[PDB]
Write a protein that binds this ligand. Structure first.
Ligand SMILES: N[C@@H](Cc1cc(=O)oc2cc(O)ccc12)C(=O)O
Lengths: 219, 215
């Protein structure tokens, strides 16, 4: 098979700056027609692949002219000038010279933006859940940068541990920030036993840690 | 107006077979080559093969010969991918895409999620994350298997400020996620907020109103 190497695996680029990424083939992609049989695709998060460039240099119908390509023989380059938040995703090259057609392993575009502190929100468990015997307490860190953050749970001032997990979004398609959810799971009995539920957030955008808390029953 | 519509998510047993569909509308599938692409969770795109819809002839990546069979029904406007002797390596999203001489790779389906498992499906429990300038509210989508779930807000009328989190596994071997949205605090007494949660493997669809807390 023809092998396509995409190096590096991840490149960071600042909003509004240009970037170049590489696809190198194990053999020449020159077809007898005089076309080089290489394509570029963008896969945004949760989406199908989207064609950007055909045959090295040709802009696909409906694609921004911020995207261009060049190269010959074995080394090809996609260029994105004035990178926008919407360009976040993974770029894949594909060769059509020989069957089987083959993809490169893909280059993730990381978008650099300014530091941003999280907005922090805490949610008690729903009365509907409590009837089922389980209590889930949720802590939301909204629209922050960079990705690193620490969430500690405390119940009546007792530092919790072992009884929580979290999820982080990929970089936002509009503003290139992250958001993070942390869920504390306890048993109806435990939750009914204790008063003060607190989420303590540490992030480099904050001059000191932020705590959001509620007292059970006190609405 | 031209579209490829792929079949729903499937939970299938190890050793069994599955057949995925890719339906053309707004064009005649016989005028196109149909490509199938695999993507295992968190991995890259893998070319499976492609069928000439006018002739039925297929090219395959030999890594899949004896597991993958691409076919086309010219009359019904549908292409298919059949996978046999399923293993956990076949858990993935499968995309279909067309190619023509004038437009190249200009059209893809939204992908079909296939999960190969001995385990039975579980549908989600949906709970409100009730709101406290800007307010946050949401829905907790708890204890389902397999992926994926879909979440919308107000039947898709509300897109701005929504964040639907990646699923995480619990120690139970079941997935959980949350979807949140930030809204003007002034809308809390006026505007209704409903999360719409669908899970095809469990034949689950739920709508949960999220409204200010209590007292
Ligand atoms: N005679 C060609 C036509 C073709 C079919 C296709 O599915 O994809 C393509 C991609 C190309 O960049 C060029 C030609 C094709 C062939 O069977 O390979």
């Amino acid at each position: 098979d023809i092998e396509l190497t995409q190096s590096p695996s991840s490149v960071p680029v600042t909003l509004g700056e240009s970037v170049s990424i590489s696809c190198r083939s194990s053999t020449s992609l020159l077809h007898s027609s005089g076309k080089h049989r290489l394509y570029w695709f963008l896969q945004r998060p949760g989406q199908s692949p989207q064609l950007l460039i055909y045959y090295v240099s040709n802009l696909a119908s409906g694609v921004s002219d911020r995207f261009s390509g060049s190269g010959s023989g074995t080394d090809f380059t996609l260029r994105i000038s004035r990178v926008e938040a919407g360009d976040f995703g993974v770029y894949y090259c594909l060769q059509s010279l020989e069957y089987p057609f083959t993809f490169g392993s893909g280059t993730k575009l990381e978008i650099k933006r300014t530091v941003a502190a999280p907005s922090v929100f805490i949610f008690p468990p729903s009365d509907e859940q409590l009837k089922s015997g389980t209590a889930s307490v949720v802590c939301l860190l909204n629209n922050f940068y960079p990705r690193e953050a620490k969430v500690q749970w405390k119940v009546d001032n007792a530092l919790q541990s072992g009884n929580s997990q979290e999820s982080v979004t990929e970089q936002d398609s509009k503003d290139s920030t992250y958001s993070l959810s942390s869920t504390l799971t306890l048993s109806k009995a435990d939750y009914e036993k204790h008063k003060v539920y607190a989420c303590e957030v540490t992030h480099q955008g904050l001059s000191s840690p932020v705590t959001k808390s509620f007292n059970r029953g006190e609405c | 107006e031209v579209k490829l519509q792929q079949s729903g998510a499937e939970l299938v047993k190890p050793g069994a077979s599955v057949k995925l569909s890719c339906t053309a509308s707004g064009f005649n599938i016989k005028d196109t080559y149909i490509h199938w692409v695999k993507q295992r969770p968190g991995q890259g795109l893998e070319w499976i093969g492609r069928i000439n819809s006018a002739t039925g002839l297929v090219k395959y990546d030999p890594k899949f010969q004896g597991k993958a069979t691409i076919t086309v029904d010219m009359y019904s406007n549908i292409a298919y991918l059949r996978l046999t002797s399923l293993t956990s390596e076949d858990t993935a999203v499968y995309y279909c895409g067309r190619w023509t001489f004038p437009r190249y790779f200009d059209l893809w389906g939204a992908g079909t999620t296939v999960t190969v498992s001995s385990a039975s499906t579980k549908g989600p429990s949906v709970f409100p994350l009730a709101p406290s300038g800007t307010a946050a509210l949401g829905c907790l989508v708890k204890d389902y298997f397999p992926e994926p779930v879909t979440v919308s807000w107000n039947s898709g009328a509300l897109t701005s400020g929504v964040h639907t989190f990646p699923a995480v596994l619990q120690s139970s071997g079941l997935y959980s996620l949350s979807s949140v949205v930030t809204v003007p605090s002034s809308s809390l007494g006026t505007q209704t907020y409903i999360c719409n949660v669908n899970h095809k493997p469990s034949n689950t669809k739920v709508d949960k109103k999220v409204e200010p807390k209590s007292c």
